[PDB]
Structure formats: structure tokens, C-alpha cells
Ligand binder design. Sequence first.
Ligand SMILES: CCCCCCCC/C=C\CCCCCCCC(=O)OC[C@H](COP(=O)(O)OCCN)OC(=O)CCCCCCC/C=C/CCCCCCCC
Lengths: 345, 69, 750, 198
Amino acid sequence: MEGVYFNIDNGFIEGVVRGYRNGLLSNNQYINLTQCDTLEDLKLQLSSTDYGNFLSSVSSESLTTSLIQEYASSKLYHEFNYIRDQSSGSTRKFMDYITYGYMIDNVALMITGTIHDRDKGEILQRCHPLGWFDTLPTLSVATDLESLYETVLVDTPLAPYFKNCFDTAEELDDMNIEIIRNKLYKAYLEDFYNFVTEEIPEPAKECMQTLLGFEADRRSINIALNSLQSSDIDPDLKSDLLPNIGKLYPLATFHLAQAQDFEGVRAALANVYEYRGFLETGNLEDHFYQLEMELCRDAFTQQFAISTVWAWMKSKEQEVRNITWIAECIAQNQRERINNYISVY
Amino acid sequence: TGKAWCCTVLSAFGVVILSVIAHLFNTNHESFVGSINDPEDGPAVAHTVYLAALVYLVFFVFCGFQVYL
Amino acid sequence: EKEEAIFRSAEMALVQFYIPQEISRDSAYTLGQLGLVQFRDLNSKVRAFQRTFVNEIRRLDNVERQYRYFYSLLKKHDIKLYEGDTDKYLDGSGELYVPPSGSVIDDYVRNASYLEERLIQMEDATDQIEVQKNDLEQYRFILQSGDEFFLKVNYVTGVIARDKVATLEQILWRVLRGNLFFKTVEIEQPVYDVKTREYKHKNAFIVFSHGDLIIKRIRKIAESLDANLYDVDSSNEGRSQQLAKVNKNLSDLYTVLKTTSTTLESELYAIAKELDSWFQDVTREKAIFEILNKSNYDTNRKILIAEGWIPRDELATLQARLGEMIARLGIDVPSIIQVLDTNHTPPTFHRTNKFTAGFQSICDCYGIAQYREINAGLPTIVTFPFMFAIMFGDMGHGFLMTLAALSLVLNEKKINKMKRGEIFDMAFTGRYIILLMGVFSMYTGFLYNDIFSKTMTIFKSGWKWPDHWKKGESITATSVGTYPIGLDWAWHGTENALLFSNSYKMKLSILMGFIHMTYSYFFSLANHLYFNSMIDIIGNFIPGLLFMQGIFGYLSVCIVYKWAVDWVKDGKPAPGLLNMLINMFLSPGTIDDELYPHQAKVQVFLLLMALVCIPWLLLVKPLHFKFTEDFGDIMIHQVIHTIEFCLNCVSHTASYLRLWALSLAHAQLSSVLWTMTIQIAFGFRGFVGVFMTVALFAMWFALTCAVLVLMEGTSAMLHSLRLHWVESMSKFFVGEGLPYEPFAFEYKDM
Amino acid sequence: SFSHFLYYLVLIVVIVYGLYKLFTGHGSDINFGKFLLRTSPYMWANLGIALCVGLSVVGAAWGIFITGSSMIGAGVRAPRITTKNLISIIFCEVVAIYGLIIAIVFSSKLTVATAENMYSKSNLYTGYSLFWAGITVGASNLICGIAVGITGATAAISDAADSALFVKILVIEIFGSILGLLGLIVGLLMAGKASEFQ
Ligand SMILES: CCCCCCCC/C=C\CCCCCCCC(=O)OC[C@H](COP(=O)(O)OCCN)OC(=O)CCCCCCC/C=C/CCCCCCCC
């Protein structure tokens, strides 16, 4: 059963990670930040939290809503690499797959810079540090993809994921790069679905199939709406961008690819209750964030499951996104939407 | 230093324990020679142990001067 | 009329302070010099930034940051930091002194801000020079290498790290499609980076090719990786020519760096001798405002209002010191102090000396005691090392512990001044715990009669062998008398020796835990009679007493009675006590072998009495609550109390068998260690026999001092601790008390 | 796979061997009755005493690293729990004590018997009983030890969340401990009427 063999390898991990969640902020703690006046009062209050002295090195003028997002994120990443260090075996695989989705973003981000002729330093600062690999800045060399592939990206673990991508043009531009980026997630989210079904045991298996199904469904919806900006795209092409694991597959991914307008999308999502009313009312992106937290809140009801590492990151990322929103509103003195923060804990 | 204190306290009680032992073999104390598997001749073993204690006594006085300086 | 606070916690009082706003800053220094007062937080609902002294605290928080910056640059260099008088302020004995001014503190601000502007510039004028330096040395080192390096623009050349030397080489194999011509040369001494702050091994590479398009991609790949490309002319004239220009500028550059680097360090020697006296005088200005931030601030009047706990004995000294403070000032102030009586939980405080402190620091780990209850620290002075010595139980290994600690006791003045590690603290913090674990182990070993696995032969023996026997004939001994003190030495070497000792040490262990448990259960009573809780006596004490005494006292009375009967002479058969205890539950009224008359008529009564005490323990106290949802909370706490108390009387009594087990194990390892090592040498003679006795004794003595004292001592010591935290203290120790952490200044190590 | 293939290649030899003897009129040759009679009752009695204290130590040592590995992780942020959650390590150790009380009781019943009266009604009875009683106490305390470790790894995590919740989960941890005490009782009832070897 669950707890009989889990603790041999991952007992210490589970305890630290469930201590990292108790430092997640509550609704009462977000209010105390809300009624602050300046950023010097926003610093004193997070000292009372589990953030502590993450800004002790910093003076009055040096405070910005940019420098706060940097040191709140950098505290998540040291905690991640600490846990990934202590891990071994399947748990070390699981924690490497989580990082393969952050370097896909950085591949697409270095390349678009070269098309606009910018310096790597100016770009590397805008790169996410969990998606780092040794030959990342070497992608600044060439624009042809097959050049970039053979010389650099073969050694990477991204090599299997470029099969369906050798249709690029001799010249390379924004809308071509985005199509590449979406083919990778299609192959990444299908390899990391089968990996869980084979090696990762229950009940974490049941929970990660769900959490990865939401990541798939969320993309298939955005990729369709972005296409409405475009002039026209063949239907069989979009079929090569939409993954094949969620609730939408197979019935609705058919009717999404063949959606010419917003109404044609609602005709496709109406036959699924989980996603029925997002388009109908309110901001779309907030509806997903509120459903991500609810699924992660339910992963912590379990025990002896390695899915809490996924749940923990996504929770604390949204924590960071709320801090910055509150911080901008304070400096800019706009306080109409300061209560926009998303919290389930 | 500790390289010298070690053989000083060690060889301190080697002089003491081995001498108390040799006294008993010599006097043929029951616990040391009473069983058959114990040695047959008491004082012969004491003669061998009186000398062994002197060897520890030399290490004691030598290392005493070493630490004393 | 000063009280002692070891059997029970000290009595405390709650006091109120009417401080004017003028002398608030000055009074707080004096209260910190005492170290007697523990302040409550009155402004507990106010948010952290809405508090009033927050602006004064940021001026001082910024200063501490600026000082952390200074201590970093120091440690970045080999400078040592000056250490001033840690006693010039106080000696820790509650003495008075006058505090700094408000203008001195405002000078630390502008000074510290003024120093940050200079050092931050002097460091960057230094680092930028070192970058120019490292670039040229690499440009110089490469030129030293000969022409073979340039044998096989024609070529590309530079410097790179050893770690990125294979990654670069693979890629260039892929670009050029095999037509690769690559040479690399190493460097042995690492290179210190100034931004990355690391020492780095490096190499120097070179690449050959003729295509113009192909070089510009080689130059980007090498620069995408951290590599610094350099120009080198192919002639052996253009190399020495450039080399002279470089070795010239480098000689120039040594002087330019040498001047600025020294102008930098000169400023630090000023800082390094007036730093640890500024840092202290700032953290103490912090400390008082936080105290003053716990206080309410009247806007109608400058009176500050505060609250604190103080020991009732230490009150007349408080009134005294403040009377002295007002004297030098010359102000007329009304009575600052008013004693306040209100329902709160005061803090718990026990006065400890050097002898009681280590025993008290053991119980405080498990929990802080409730206000005015029996302390678990007085019994622990004796019962902790005596349980150790039942297990340990040897005159040799105990005499060694006694010396090891008696060196720490006599040199304590020398040791306390000098600085200590982390292991050597606890050996010093418990230097009196180890003294008593040694003395008692010489008593218990004498009774067991074991000295380094052997026996003493002090008295006459109560056993006698036959007048005549022969070799190999199993012989039995006949009784004469009783041995006065300890186990008789006739058992030593005997075939049936464990059958006697195992039976003996079990019955010791069962009797010595029953006394340890009951004595700690009469501390519940002593509390209930001090807080006037009559119902808990009739509810909890009297029923639980009858439960276990009727079961586990009947066992202990029968062990003492069976030992006191001559069964063989009388002709009756001795009964087994394990079966007698089982059958009384399973099959009352039945006996197989009798221990005393009317055995069955008394057993069934004791069974009757225990079963009555279960529901009387279950029901009596909640009914009193109802008679006077909350009634449920009084029940479920009372229904769990019994199912534990009854089970735990069976699992605690069984736990005390570790007294027997760790004793038996310690004894056998000692004999096996003697029988393998020293017993062998005695069977040799000559010079070769003399040498083995010298070699084998040392290995006996070393394994003895390590395996049988340190490894076994630390095991048994922690099992003795368990029997206190889990078995004894469960009977009476409530816990969840508030500690006593007064406000007092101390030296902060930085 | 390989390990599962052998389980199915054993089952197929026991069947082909049973039917060889049966169809040939030799099914009586596979006689379990003689094996129970002719085997020595000291074998059965010395396995049970070993499999009691052995299988009880497996369970105790098991629960100590489920409860111990979570406390130490939880104790990083809440170091105050390692002495409050210590009670879970105590109910896991105590099932080993139960397996050592038995072995004290049963060792008394190990006596030498004459060669003529070795395979008697009473000495066979006494070997069968100390075998299944040892199995009973050992295999039952193996289960009570693993269970209490799972229960007590949660109570460490809940206590680090909030001090109040620790008390509420102990009730689950007490009921689990009853399993080891019942096993001890059942074993003593089996070996109650068993008599030492004559
Ligand atoms: C396993 C084989 C090796 C064994 C090596 C043993 C070496 C000798 C170790 C010292 C043993 C004797 C001292 C122990 C009793 C006294 C302990 C004591 O007073 O603890 C107090 C302390 C509270 O105060 P402090 O944290 O000290 O801080 C304030 C101090 N003013 O108490 C507690 O923490 C509660 C628990 C007490 C019992 C703890 C015992 C732990 C023993 C660990 C031994 C470690 C040995 C390491 C060997 C490494 C060798 C290179």
C-alpha cells in the first residue's frame, strides 16, 4: 500500500515539502499587505511571514516591484534545487521532467531575440533559471533550425521532441517559432504522461494524470483563440499542435480545430461541464488559475505521494504573482483591483 | 600533546593492572589458576608479566618528560 | 527571606509602569541592566507598520546593514577583527551605568552612511584594475608557448575553462564536418574571478581554418561560451614585440593597483578597531524601542503604560534602582510602580546552581512546567544516574568515568574561560551528571561483584564444595550460610550461572520500576492538595491507585514472600509467578500450587476491585460537571485518559526490563573481550610472550575505553532518560507552561 | 517474468508428480501424517521462539523509519516536535518487548526427553503449539508495527502544522496498539496447557 515502501527514499523529502507549504500565505495575511502604504511597509510585513530577511541587504531607494519579484522567485529556486539534490531514482527523473518545460520557453526566447538582433546578456537576464543548460547561449549563433539542431540541441534531452518540426522555412520568424514551441509541449506532455503511468505508483499516478490533463486542456483552448487573430489555417495543421491526453481528447479537439470563431468554440466546450462557463463570463486567465489552485489544494489531502512537489511549486508561483500585483498597485497608487489576488489557502 | 598523553595514561594503568594481575598468579589465586584450562604454573606467568609492566613504565616516564617540557 | 525555587516554581507578580515620554528612553536602559522583567505585548492587535516607534527602528536597522557590509570586506581579506572589553558595560551582576546620548547615535548614522559611499567606490576602482590585469596575463601566458602551438586569418585562438573544453570541441567537429584541427594547452594554477568569486582552472586553445564565413561562426561559439579571444601574430618576431608591450604595461599596472589597494586597507584598519564597540551600542538602542513598542501610548498625556512579570522577592530592589535613576536626573516623578492583580498565567522560573542546572536542562527539553507544580528536576538528580548504574554496573568501567569527569570539575575555571566546541560543551555542561554515574556504578558493580569481568573474594562464601572429587566430574556445592554483601563469588565460572542471575535481575527490575512509578504518582496528590482540586483526588487518584497496586503490587509482594520461604525443607513445591498472574484473570478460584492460605479468596476480590475502578474512573468526574457540548469535552478527555492509563500500566511495567537486558549484554561482551585478548597472552613464554602481553593489553584497554564506556554509556544514558520522560513524568507532569525570558543585555557574537 | 515463471513452474511439477503417483496406485506415498509424526518436536519449538522475536523486531524497526524519517523532515521548520512526537517511537518499540516476554515463557518449556517417550502424545502437542503461537505473536506484531508507523508519520506532519491536531490523531494510534496486546493473549492461551518435554 501507500506508506509501506515510500519512506525508504522519499520520507525526508515529503516532510520538508509539507513544511514549505505551511509558509504559504493565508487570506488574512494578504489583507495585512493590502492596507500597506509604501514598499518600505510592505517589506516590514513579510518579515512576519516565512520570507523573513529576504530583503535585508536592500536600502530605501533600491526597492522596486521588479527587485521584489526577483528575490521572491530566487528563494523558490534554491528550495527546488535543494530538494532535487536529495532525490534519487524515479524521483530524480520526475524532477528533471519538470524542468524540461522551462527550457522549451528559453529556446523560443533566445531565437526570437536573434531575429531582432539583440545581445545575449540583455536576453539571458530574461531567461528562467530552471530552464538552463550549458549550450543555451550558443543558440544565438544561427537562424536556420537544422543548423541549431545538429550543432547544439542533439546532445540535449529535447532531441526526441523535434520529429514533427522539420517543416520550417529557410528563414525563421515569430509565427514560425511559436508553432515550433507548441509542437514541443505536445510531445513533452505526452512523454511525461506515459512516464507517470509506467513508473510512478498510486495514488500520485491518479493525481498527476489529472494535473497534466489540465495543462493540456488549458493550452488547447488558448491555441485555438490565438488562431482567431490569424487569417486562415488548415485544420489538419492545428491537429499537430493540440495534445492528446486530457478530457477534451478526442471528441472536442476535433471540433476545436474546426472552429472559425468564438461561437464555434463554445459549441465545442459546452459538452464538458468542467470547462463549461469560463468563456461565458469574466476574465479567462483568472478562471484557470482558480482551478489550478483547487486541484493542488486537493493533492495535499493525500499522503505518501510525490505529487506534492508539483503542487507546491505551482502554489508558490501564484503566491509570487500576487505579491507583484499588490506591489505595483501600491507604488502606482491605483487601488481599484488590488483585491484581484487569487488564494485558496 | 595528544600524541603523548595517550601513551601516558595508557601506560599509567598498564603498570597498575598488570602488576595486580602478576601478584595473583604468583600467590596462586583460585580465580586465575583454578580451572583446568588455566595455566598450570602460577609464578612462571607472573615472571613474564612483571617484565611486561616495566616496558609500559619506560613509555610512561619518557612521555612524562615529553609533555612536561 | 529570599525563597528557594527548586521543589516548586517561584512566585511572581504583575506590575504596571507609568512612564513619562521624556524619560522612557532612559528608564528602558536600567530595566535591561537588571535582567528581571518580562514584558507583555499590550499592542497585540496593531499591525507591524502601524506601531509608533517603527520610524526610529529603521534608522538603526539600516546601520546594522551597513556594518554587515564592512565585516564582509574584512573577511574577504585576511584581516582579523579587534576584540574589546566585553565587561566594560557590565559584569552580569545587575550593576547600574549611564547610557549614551541621542546625539552620539545620530553620529553613527551619518558616519556609517559616509563610510559606505567611500568604500563602495574604493572597491570598484580596485576591481576594475584587476580585470585589466587578468586579461593581460592570459594574453601574456599564451605568447610564452612556442611555434608548434601554431603549426598545424589562418587561425583562431583564446583562453577557456577546462570544463567547457570538450563541449566546444564536439560542436566544431559537427560544424566543419570532420575537418577539425584543434590543439589545447593547460594551466596548473587556478584563476580567481572577481565577479563569480571562484578559483578556476583554465586552458588555452587554438583552431585552424581558411573560410571567412566559417571563422565568424567559430568566434561566436567561443564567445557564447565564456572565452576571451586574442590576436597573435604568426611570426616569431611579432610575438616578442607584442610581448614586450604587454610585459611593460603589466609592470606599470602593478604600481597602479599597489597604491589604490593600500589606500583601501588603510581605511579598514580604522574600522577594524572601532567596530565591535559600535555594533553593541546600536543593538541595545534597538532592544529598548521594541520593548517600548509593546507599550500603549496615551495621546491625552505623555504617560506610557506597560506591564511586566517580576518575581515577588525581587521587587524591593526594583523600587530601589529606579529611586537612584531619578536621583541623578533631578526630576520630581510620582510613584512609577503599581502592583496589578489579574487572572493570567505567570511564567515559570526555577533558580538553578551549577549542580542543579544540568539536571534541570534535561526536563526542560521535554516540557516547561506549569506554574507552582512539582518540579521533575529534584528526583532526577538521583534517579537518572542510579538507573544508569543498574545497567552499566561495573567497578572498572565506572572508575574510568569517575576520572574523566573529575578532570572537568577541577579545571572548570580554566575550561570556562577558554573557548569550546559543540561536543565538548555537553561533556562540560554535564560534568556533574557523569560524576554520579560513576560513583553509583562502583556501588552497583560491588553488589554484582564485577570488576573488568572478574570477581572479588572479600568475604567467606555461603557455599561449599565436596571434600573430595576427581577430574571431569560434575560437582555441586552445598549451602553453609548467606553471603553478606553482593553475589557470592562461587557463581563465577559456574555452568548454571545465568539461570541464577537472570532470575535475580528480572525481579530487581520489576520491583525497582514499581517503586519509581508509585512514588511519582504521589506527586499528583501533592499538587491537587496545593490547588484545592478535591474532585480529582476522588476522581483520578484513588481509583487509579487501586487499579495497579492490586495487580502489580500483588506481584511485588509475592516476589518478596517467595524469597522468604524455605520451600525444600517444608516439602511444598515452589509456584511459578507468571502462571499465577495469568490464571487469576483467565480462571479465578483455581490454583495449581499454593503460595499462601486463602490465595483464591483474595485474588478474586482484587479482580473485583480493579473492575469497579474502571467505570468509577470513567464516569465520576463528568457527572460532577453536569451537576456542577462542553459536557462532551469533559467526557472525551476522560474516556481517553482511562484507556491509556490502563494499557500504559501494562506497557510501562514491561519497559523496565531494559534494566536487565542492557546489564546482561554489557557483562558478556566484557568477558568475551577478556577471553579473546588477554587470556591468550598468558599461554606464552619467553621474549615473544612478553611482547604479546604488551600488544594485547593495549587493544583490550582501547576497545574497553571506546566500545564498553562510550558506546555503551551513551546507550544506557539515553534509556535512563526515556524512563523519566515517558514513564515517571507521565504520572504527574502536566506541562504547557510559559517560560521565563526576561529582558537583559548580552554580548552578541556577530 | 522470470520470478513469476518459477512460481508457475513449481505448481506444474507438484501437479505432474501428484498424478504420477495417483494413477499408478501410489498416492499414499505422499503422506503428510508421517512427516508430522517423525519430525522432531524440538524443530517446531525452536522455530517459533525465533520467528516470534524475529518477526516482531522486523515490524518495530519498520515503523521507526516511517515515523522517524518524517519527523526529521518536519522538524526542520518545527524543531519543537521531536520530543512531543516521540511517543510514536515508543508504541513501535513495545511490540518487540512482547516478543521477548513470550520467549521467556516458552524457553522454560524446553527440556530434555527420554528417547522412548520422545514421540508421545504430549511432546508432539507441545511442539505444534509453540510453533503456531510464535507465528501468531510474531506475524501479528509485524502488522501492528507497520500500521503504527503510518499513523505516526501523519501525526508528525499535523503537529508541525498545528499543535492542537496532535492529540486528535493519537486516538488512532492507541487503537492500533491493541492489536499487539491481543496477539500476546492468544499465544498464552494456546501454550497454557502445553507441558514441558518429559
Ligand atoms: C556513539 C559512540 C560515541 C559516543 C561519544 C560520547 C562522547 C561524550 C558526549 C558527552 C556525554 C555527556 C554529556 C551529556 C549530558 C549533559 C547534556 C546536557 O546538559 O545537555 C543540555 C541540553 C540543553 O542545553 P544545550 O543545548 O546544551 O544549550 C545550553 C547549554 N548551557 O539538553 C538537551 O538538549 C536535552 C537532551 C539531553 C541529552 C542529550 C544527550 C546527547 C548525547 C550525544 C552524544 C554525541 C556524541 C558525538 C561523538 C562524536 C565524536 C567525534
